[PDB]
Write a protein that binds this ligand. Structure first.
Ligand SMILES: [K+]
Ligand SMILES: [K+]
Ligand SMILES: [K+]
Ligand SMILES: [K+]
Ligand SMILES: [K+]
Lengths: 255, 255
């Protein structure tokens, strides 16, 4: 009852701030959509309203079948490269949703695929995490022996690790995405945080743009960066779990 | 090491089976799209190709800003009811993506909102899990004392727990969704699993349809069911960690 009574208000205030940060933009977007609707109607008096509804229905009929509304459909295709990373988005609980199964045969295969892969992959990432943590800790302790160990040395190593993670996964990438994707900084940072926390809305996906000249290995570099980010996330979350025991001990000292 | 090769083979075979399962349907979908695309121009020779491209462009502008392509647009609105459940999907790492921020001011608020809420919510769910597990094991041990305790009573109680979870979260819900949402069974089961594992593609959301006569509490009942499912998931994953620690020794019994 101590947590729910705070998270209820957390959701309330989140909604209260989102409703004012976003609603003006949504209203102006709807108004512009309807204005351009009527102005396309007046541009083609030859085209009737009840035909515009048919065109809209056709466009929405296959925008949820997989084919993109505009341009070519090479990046949302179902061939080997796209599928090998759709599998990854499935088994890392990210689930962007730009490509998803649309057949009763596949929709049922994806269930067992997730049920058998997600628990496996969440261990592989933890294994990578513990291995890299062992390497970092042995290097740090060797260099601390070459120096002097300190009661605050663990503070130094932990802070170095945390700042390494923050730099590599929230402050450096947005510039790479400014360069190769032509997003501004806020978009790149927002997308990086969304992807790292396995939220994955699916409005910003890296390496999928018909109007782009990506290098042949850009997508796989993105995927590898995502995997390393998830591994560091596992390491830091276990470290913070243990440091929470530490601080719940140290609090009684203050009493 | 040992896990990475298995993961790579898993990704390869998953990509193969997905490509063979989905590619025919995807190809026929886009072929039908292009067929009706030309059929529209056939219906309106008065309409031109470039007019069609401008219409498609205007429509593709909508799906980005958030305004829906067709029909009534109340369920994707940004008022209080939608905003509360959007904050929920943000702080449970589900992230459907049917509604998302589109302003640089909000896109940056969502980052700090997630960073401060997701670690909080992942504890509240663990708290609910541990509390319900305490209550359930308490009742089970009381009723086992009233009867007789057994060396395999853990098997009984744990299997009862697991079947309770599976039933209430993957086998019963699809019928409720058959009734109130008019999906078939495979869609409902797929959606239930993909929501329980915090994947959340965002093609099936329960409670958003302009052509619906939902009851005023349907959406919040769905959200509460989702939260209880996540709590049971926490309980079961902790149980799995414990039983796996157990079997890592129990294997030597077979040796
Ligand atoms: K997730
Ligand atoms: K997710
Ligand atoms: K999504
Ligand atoms: K998602
Ligand atoms: K989506």
């Amino acid at each position: 009852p101590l947590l729910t009574s705070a998270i209820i208000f957390y959701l309330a205030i989140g909604a209260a701030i989102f409703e004012v940060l976003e609603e003006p933009h949504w209203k102006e977007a709807k108004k512009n959509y309807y204005t351009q609707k009527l102005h396309l109607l007046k541009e083609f008096p030859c085209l009737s309203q009840e035909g515009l509804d048919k065109i809209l229905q056709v466009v929405s009929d296959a925008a949820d079948q997989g084919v993109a509304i505009t341009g070519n459909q090479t990046f949302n295709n179902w061939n080997w490269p796209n599928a090998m990373i759709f599998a990854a988005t499935v088994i890392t609980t990210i689930g962007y949703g730009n490509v998803a199964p649309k057949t009763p045969a596949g929709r049922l295969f994806c269930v067992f695929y997730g049920l058998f892969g997600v628990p496996l992959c969440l261990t592989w990432i933890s294994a990578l995490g513990k291995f890299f943590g062992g390497r970092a800790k042995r290097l740090g302790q060797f260099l601390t022996r070459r120096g002097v160990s300190l009661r605050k040395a663990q503070i130094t190593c932990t802070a170095i690790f945390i700042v390494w993670g923050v730099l590599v996964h929230l402050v450096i990438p947005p510039f790479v995405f400014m360069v190769t994707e032509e997003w501004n900084y806020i978009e790149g940072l927002y997308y990086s945080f969304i992807t790292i926390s396995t939220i994955g809305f699916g409005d910003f996906v890296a390496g999928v743009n018909p109007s782009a000249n990506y290098h042949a290995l850009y997508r796989y570099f993105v995927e590898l960066w995502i995997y390393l980010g998830l591994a560091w996330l596992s390491l830091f979350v276990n470290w913070k779990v243990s440091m929470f025991v530490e601080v719940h001990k140290a609090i009684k000292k203050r009493r």
